[PDB]
Amino acid sequence: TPLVHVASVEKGRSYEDFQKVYNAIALKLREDDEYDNYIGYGPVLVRLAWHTSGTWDKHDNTGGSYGGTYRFKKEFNDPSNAGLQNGFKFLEPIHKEFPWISSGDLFSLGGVTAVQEMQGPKIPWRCGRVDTPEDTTPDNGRLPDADKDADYVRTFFQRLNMNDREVVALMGAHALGKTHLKNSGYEGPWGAANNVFTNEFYLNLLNEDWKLEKNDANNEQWDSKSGYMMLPTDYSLIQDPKYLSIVKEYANDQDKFFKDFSKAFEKLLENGITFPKDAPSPFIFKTLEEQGL
Ligand code: HEM
Ligand SMILES: [O]
């Protein structure tokens, strides 16, 4: 008895209404730019979109972006979600300004906005997620561990119906932000431009000299002389032959990377959702830069 999650457009809302919401998140991103040592809220919003969508199980259509369940205690308090309360706080004010948007919509849209606003590809986005009751919240334990190898990553992602190319594309969001010891027991950034969306992840993996070290939390991570880090799961991409080939492809073709991430990210955010033939087409949002704002 796999569940059916039919999208329904917030009563009488259209492109223009979502565009305003994207703009609000966007303008707040610009303004509140001191967070995390001038990283800004971009990366944390991308993560919040991933963790809200990454609970999905293709087997029974449980979890995923549809119900916006991260708003319930059990999910909010998942040890895997440590740190995301920062992104939740950021969006609160926005949700108060636009009370008609579903929680799943807002969490998803905040990930889309951050990406575009950090100079990433355009991500087509579909509205219609509907808030579901507290008893629909998935148990803790569906997000991935970071101290594992290629075979774990691979297997983990099958649950989300993601193939090798989609997994490699997705992990390139690791160009953004950093790990924080207090959050995950990992420490440091993946690269230098932590708030600009590029293929820097792949470049870094192939080009830096990594050294297996142990951090203040007693966890092993790959460290570079330039000051970057790799999680064991990041480094696993150059350890597996199938992964490594795609890693090299995205290091040598920025355009290809953007296009594949856009596809996979939209797909992650849409998994588990049934869109009637009657539903509007995906919206492409203009950035502030394109609006002259
Ligand atoms: C094997 C899968 C993955 C694992 C194990 C992993 C693990 C991690 C960990 C441990 C952190 C640091 C949390 C903290 O200390 O602040 C992190 C940060 C982050 N993750 Fe991943 N992640 C994975 C996949 C992804 C995917 C698929 C994306 C999105 C498309 C994503 C986006 C990010 C972002 C943007 C950050 C930076 C957050 C920040 O600066 O606050 N990750 N991830
Ligand atoms: O993550």
Of the residues 50, 125, 190, 222, only one is catalytic, namely: 190
d(CA 292, CA 118) in angstroms, rounded, equals: 16
The ligand minimizing its distance to the Cα of 176 is: 1
Q: Is 174 annotated as a binding residue?
A: yes
* 3 state SS of 104: helix
Where residue 40 falls (left for φ over 0; alpha for ψ -120 to 50; beta otherwise) is: left
Q: Which token pair is 132?
A: 């579901």
CB of 46 within 6 A of ligand 1: the answer is: yes
Residue type, 142: R
List helix spans (H) across 35-149.
35-38, 42-53, 73-76, 85-97, 103-117
Domains in the chain and their CATH numbers?
Answer: 3-143+265-293 (1.10.520.10), 144-264 (1.10.420.10)
Pocket probe mutation, ligand 1, options 29, 41, 50, max atoms within 8 Å of Cβ: 50
d(CA 189, CA 193) in angstroms, rounded, equals: 9
CB of 129 within 6 A of ligand 2: the answer is: no
95 an active-site residue?
no
Helix/strand number for the chain, H first, E second: 14, 5
* 3 state SS of 182: helix
Q: Which residues of 42-68 are buried (b: 16+ CB within 10 A; e: fewer)?
A: bbbbbbbbbbbbbbbbeeebbbbbbbb
d(CA 279, CA 52) in angstroms, rounded, equals: 23
The two beta strands, 211-214 and 188-189, are unpaired
Kindly report the protein residue whose alpha carbon is nearest to atom 18 of ligand 1.
179
* 3 state SS of 57: strand
Where residue 6 falls (left for φ over 0; alpha for ψ -120 to 50; beta otherwise) is: beta
Kindly report the protein residue whose alpha carbon is nearest to atom 1 of ligand 2.
47
Q: Which token pair is 111?
A: 């990930």
Contact 58, 159 (CB under 8 A): yes
Polymer length in residues for the chain: 293
Name the burial class of residue 232, with classes exposed (0-12), middle (13-18) and buried (19+) by CB atoms within 10 angstroms of its CB.
buried
Closest CA to 199 of 187, 190, 212: 190
d(CA 25, CA 91) in angstroms, rounded, equals: 7
d(CA 133, CA 66) in angstroms, rounded, equals: 11
d(CA 197, CA 114) in angstroms, rounded, equals: 9
Q: State this model's resolution in angstroms.
A: 1.7
CB of 173 within 6 A of ligand 1: the answer is: yes
Q: Which token pair is 211?
A: 């050294």
* 3 state SS of 181: helix
The ligand minimizing its distance to the Cα of 191 is: 1
The residues, any chain, with a CB within 8 Å of residue 283's CB and separated by 6 or more, are 15, 18, 19, 124, 125, 126, 127
Q: What are phi and psi of 289, to 5 degrees?
A: -55, -45
Torsion of CA 12, 16, 22, 24, to 10 degrees: -90
d(CA 108, CA 268) in angstroms, rounded, equals: 10
Output 212-220 pairs: Cβ under 8 A, ≥24 positions apart: 215/181, 215/185, 215/186, 215/187, 216/181, 216/187, 217/181, 217/185, 217/186, 217/187, 218/185, 219/147, 219/185, 219/186, 220/147
Closest CA to 11 of 92, 87, 100: 100
180 an active-site residue?
no
d(CA 119, CA 225) in angstroms, rounded, equals: 27
* 3 state SS of 212: strand
